[PDB]
Design a protein around this nucleic acid. Structure first.
Ligand SMILES: [Mg+2]
Ligand SMILES: [Mg+2]
Ligand SMILES: [Mg+2]
Ligand SMILES: [Mg+2]
Ligand SMILES: [Mg+2]
Ligand SMILES: [Mg+2]
Ligand SMILES: [Mg+2]
Ligand SMILES: [Mg+2]
Ligand SMILES: [Mg+2]
Ligand SMILES: [Mg+2]
Ligand SMILES: [Mg+2]
Ligand SMILES: [Mg+2]
Ligand SMILES: [Mg+2]
Ligand SMILES: [Mg+2]
Ligand SMILES: [Mg+2]
Ligand SMILES: [Mg+2]
Ligand SMILES: [Mg+2]
Ligand SMILES: [Mg+2]
Ligand SMILES: [Mg+2]
Ligand SMILES: [Mg+2]
Ligand SMILES: [Mg+2]
Ligand SMILES: [Mg+2]
Ligand SMILES: [Mg+2]
Ligand SMILES: [Mg+2]
Ligand SMILES: [Mg+2]
Ligand SMILES: [Mg+2]
Ligand SMILES: [Mg+2]
Ligand SMILES: [Mg+2]
Ligand SMILES: [Mg+2]
Ligand SMILES: [Mg+2]
Ligand SMILES: [Mg+2]
Ligand SMILES: [Mg+2]
Ligand SMILES: [Mg+2]
Ligand SMILES: [Mg+2]
Ligand SMILES: [Mg+2]
Ligand SMILES: [Mg+2]
Ligand SMILES: [Zn+2]
Lengths: 98, 51, 159
RNA sequence: GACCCUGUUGAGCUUGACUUUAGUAUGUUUUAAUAAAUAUUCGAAUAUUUAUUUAUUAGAAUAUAUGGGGAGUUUGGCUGGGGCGGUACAGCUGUUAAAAAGUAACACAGCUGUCCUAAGGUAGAUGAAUGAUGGAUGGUAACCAUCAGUUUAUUAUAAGGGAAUAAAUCUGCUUUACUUUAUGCAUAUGACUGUAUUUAGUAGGGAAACCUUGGCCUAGCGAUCCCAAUUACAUUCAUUAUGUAUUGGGUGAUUGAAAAGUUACCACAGGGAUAACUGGCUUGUAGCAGGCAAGCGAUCAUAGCGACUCUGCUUUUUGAUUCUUCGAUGUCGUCUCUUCUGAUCAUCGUA
RNA sequence: AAAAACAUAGCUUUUUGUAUUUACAAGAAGUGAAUUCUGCCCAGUGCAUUUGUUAAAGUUGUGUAAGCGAAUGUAAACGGCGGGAGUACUAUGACUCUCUUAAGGUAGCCAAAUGCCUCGUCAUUUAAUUGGUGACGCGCAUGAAUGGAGCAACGA
RNA sequence: ACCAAUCGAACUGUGUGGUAGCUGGUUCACAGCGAAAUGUCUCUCAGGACAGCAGUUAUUAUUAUAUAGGACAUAGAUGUAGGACACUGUUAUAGUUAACUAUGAGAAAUCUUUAAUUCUAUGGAAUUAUAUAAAUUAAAUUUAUAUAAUGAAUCUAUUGUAUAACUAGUGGGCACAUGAUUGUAAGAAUGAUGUGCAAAAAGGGAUGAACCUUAUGAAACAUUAAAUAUUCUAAAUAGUAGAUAUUAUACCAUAAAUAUGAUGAAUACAUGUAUUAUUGUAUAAAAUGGAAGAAGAUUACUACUUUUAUGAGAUGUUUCUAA
RNA sequence: AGUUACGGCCAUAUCUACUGUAAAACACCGGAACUCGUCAGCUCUCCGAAGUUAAGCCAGUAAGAGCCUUGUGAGUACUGAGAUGGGAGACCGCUCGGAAAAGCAAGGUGCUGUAAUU
């Protein structure tokens, strides 16, 4: 699947169409001051393990998240596409019958 | 199980007609959900200037 | 034949013989007002606005008129009772329900008989539909009618 | 009922099942003072090593590894009995299916966890597949003209449906693969999902009417808690944390526990809702007979046999089903002894 | 359930030179008198020996662990020890070619308490044998201290 | 193997009235009313919850200007039996100058076609005059809303209809008639429509959960239904004719391919040869002593009609008890 | 009474052969200086009026193919309700109701709305 890097869409803050810029999305690294880690750090000071881990899974590929960005607002939007195995952005377009 | 019977549809019709079959009355028209919103606003304005 | 939106439609959503193609202009010129009577017939050449296959051929009433849809009210038979359904369809799937035309003519003509009897002192002689009772009497003539003798006939094999 | 099955009932035992622990190995910090030597870092800080007596009860607190020597617990469902095999455990099309709607089988033939910045949107132009007759090298089959050509061709894919001024092939231009108020249909007493329709904006194609909320339509569908990202704001002050809204990370047993075996040393509650033996309905298999007559018999169908086909009986083999017995009806063979059937091995009478 | 099971002497491997006891001693394992033998394999799993990855505590700051991984030995440690084609009246194949592997069952033994087809083939024992004994071997699935071969004495 | 008649973890007291989706039991009379064995979800299949079926109490009348497991009149939807070889799949042979013409066979996943049946909707409201709008149009121009007036119009039945609140049992079903799928077949397995047994009395099928007559308090008298009239056993051995075989049952408790006889039967042909209808015998073999219900019957068997009589909480007449 | 511009229903309006039409109209027809389009003024686009009724449009003929309609087929096939009717079975017969197609004959070959011109 080939995806472009420039898309001109409606922006809600400016109330007009404006050229956006497209980038991929990756899950960032978690931290230990969030409340889910402070509970789990103090529960685990007991002999054994207290919370389950998922062991059997069957999915193969994940969905795609995008990031459009208005230059005037400097504010980001998020959009979603279907599942795909090979994702390349900004490639060279198709050539008609050569 | 003992590979029992899966399921039938016998006397479904007999249990229905025990107390009759009631017909739910449609009310007055222009009151059912889904009327055009542009049509309803003009109907409201026409009644206020009447009375 | 699993549970989907368009299951088991082979002879219900097939266009008949020597009648393929996009519909004509006489469909689009018709108008609908609130309170009429409308039957539903699916034309299987457009794919925007088709109802479910259960409602093919049931008559309802029109209560709303939108820029792209018409609203029809019906009755469905859910397990015990008779409920109320509403659907929005396009204009290329409807048909004007006849059957009140002989009734609405009788309303207009009885309303004229009531008007002419106001100027007189007589009682009203309304128009109502006829009744069929016992067989009436008739008169036959034996001047030109001669009876024909009928009897049995012996059996004859076909070969 | 000890055999067999069920129970979200147990116990003894093993191990590359899940989760841990006694014992033990190795770091760091605590350790008598003194003098000297050596090394490593920049006069100073660390480390190593020797000597003396003024200490010398011999240990303590933490971290990583090893650890069936031990300790708890688990080891799906459907099923013509269970196991082995398959998944009929989630979605989609045609037939079973009996001219409104609805409907079963470890019944029939199949498909699905994908592909696409164009295979999405719009404007315009256009006789596709094939056949006939001809044209230097040119042949069954290279390319060019003429005539015919009702859908045979194509439309990402399973099957069904639709489309001939075309939804197909080309040429141009674009990102509606949008943001916000309300409602319906599968469909219900009911979540999640798919898909039609509306109020107000902002855009693309076109001369304009008009079309456009992803693929011509019916499939590629995932809650609570927690984690990551985006947009608004909230407190004496900075940074952080917590709240409301939207997406992504996932449970294929698909409306969703975190999980390997064995018992012939075995235990408990129950089950004829369910097997191993007798009985009962059935006769594929087994056994015993019939009808017709191509031919064999030195010529002659029927002295004696009989191919290709067709119609029966019996309960004497072996199967198919699970109606009665699981708070018990003692299995194979042999020894002894009585009686019964004709489909007669001799003995009797005929042909 | 008295035996073909256990024990036994005999044979072999291993740990310890700071033992109230002191290596002709003290702990841990396997086979099972004597005679004759004890073949090949360290790729896998274990065991031993020797120079990329990895926690906490401390210091203005920085640095340094065992273990795992890699190399070399070890099978009287757990264990394992193939298949197809042509070639000297018929027939067979001393000899040759070829897939791979860690190595491709050697000395011996047998339808044996170990052979499904199977009541294997030949001889002998009997009037008559699915029994017994002696020979044969492409051995479903024999085989060397998980011991192979063997009977003098002894046996409810 | 042994550790006090106990050992694959001894014996005594306590936590303890340990938990059980699993067996067993559950105590007085009469009266009113009366079911389900089906759909969806479930580490769910010997169990649960929601929906359906039931009971009790309450308020209210043009929701009789209304309703109906009905009919009639009108307007419609459909692709199953039958039909066809024209489209898709299939098949045997002869002709004429690859194309046309014939006689034959066909379809659960084929259609130029197309019934009986099943189902949906209308059978009373409509017109006139005046007004309102911020919708809509080139426009009083339409789309909508008010107020006033003008009305009972298809046959039959129903004196009530409608609305709330609270709560139990059940979720293993089986049989007959009609028509189907798998299987050689089954008192086999699994679906569709109606009625039953479960939970239903009396009379008849000799006996039998489901077959045939048939609606319900305690009794007496007359009339029938289903079925029977030699005797057991209440009720006429009340008629025409045929059957020679120990003949004779609606569900129902078995008989075939095949070979041959007989009628004062019929038609064709030369007293007889051919067919057709009715009917008899052979084919026809089992395990303790046997089943038309039995004794026995040839006028107690079989076929077709009319009278008479016997015979059910049925149906009529009289007495009495239940809100 | 026919044509010509917009149409509604969409074969009685299609297909293959021959034959005919006065006026007006509709066509064929003559060319690329400009707008536009190609390899090619073939098509499309833009200016014209010498010639021609040969074709197209319109109307006719055919024991013509195709479509539309009436009769026969036929009370035949089939089917809703029923009985202690018949058969070893496969199935068939009866009572009260509903009711077909394919063929085989006879006949037909567009009807119409608003406007304009002879
Ligand atoms: Mg369970
Ligand atoms: Mg346990
Ligand atoms: Mg354990
Ligand atoms: Mg099971
Ligand atoms: Mg497309
Ligand atoms: Mg779409
Ligand atoms: Mg589920
Ligand atoms: Mg044992
Ligand atoms: Mg027990
Ligand atoms: Mg049973
Ligand atoms: Mg027995
Ligand atoms: Mg046989
Ligand atoms: Mg006994
Ligand atoms: Mg006993
Ligand atoms: Mg005999
Ligand atoms: Mg002894
Ligand atoms: Mg003893
Ligand atoms: Mg021993
Ligand atoms: Mg030895
Ligand atoms: Mg090694
Ligand atoms: Mg070695
Ligand atoms: Mg050898
Ligand atoms: Mg030996
Ligand atoms: Mg022998
Ligand atoms: Mg003891
Ligand atoms: Mg009652
Ligand atoms: Mg029980
Ligand atoms: Mg309930
Ligand atoms: Mg009809
Ligand atoms: Mg019961
Ligand atoms: Mg009775
Ligand atoms: Mg009987
Ligand atoms: Mg008597
Ligand atoms: Mg009497
Ligand atoms: Mg009575
Ligand atoms: Mg009575
Ligand atoms: Zn912006």
């Amino acid at each position: 699947v080939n995806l472009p890097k420039v898309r001109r869409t409606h922006c809600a803050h400016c109330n007009a169409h404006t050229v956006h810029k497209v980038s991929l999305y990756k899950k960032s690294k978690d931290s230990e001051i969030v409340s889910g880690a402070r509970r789990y750090r103090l529960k685990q000071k007991t002999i054994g393990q207290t919370k389950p881990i998922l062991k059997r899974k069957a999915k193969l590929t994940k969905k795609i998240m995008l990031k459009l960005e208005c230059p005037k607002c400097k504010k980001i939007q998020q959009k979603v596409c279907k599942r795909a195995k090979h994702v390349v952005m900004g490639g060279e377009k198709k050539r008609k019958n050569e | 199980m003992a590979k029992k019977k899966n399921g039938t549809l016998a006397n479904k019709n007999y249990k229905d007609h025990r107390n009759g079959i009631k017909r739910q009355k449609i009310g007055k028209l222009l009151e059912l959900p889904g009327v055009n919103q542009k049509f309803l606003r003009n109907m409201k304005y026409a009644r206020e200037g009447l009375k | 034949s699993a549970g989907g939106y368009r299951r088991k439609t082979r002879q219900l959503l097939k266009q008949p013989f020597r009648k393929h193609g996009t519909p004509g202009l006489s469909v689009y010129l018709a108008t609908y007002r609130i309170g009429d009577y409308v039957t539903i017939s699916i034309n299987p050449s457009i794919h925007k606005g088709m109802p479910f296959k259960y409602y093919h051929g049931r008559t309802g009433r029109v209560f709303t008129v939108n820029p792209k849809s018409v609203g029809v009210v019906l009755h469905k038979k859910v397990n015990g009772r008779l409920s109320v359904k509403t659907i929005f369809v396009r204009v290329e799937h409807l048909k004007k329900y006849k059957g009140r035309d002989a009734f609405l003519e009788r309303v207009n003509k009885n309303n004229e008989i009531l008007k002419e009897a106001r100027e007189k002192g007589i009682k009203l002689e309304y128009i109502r539909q006829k009744e069929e009772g016992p067989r009436e009497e008739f008169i036959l003539n034996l001047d030109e009618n001669k009876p024909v003798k009928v009897g049995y006939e012996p059996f004859i094999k076909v070969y």
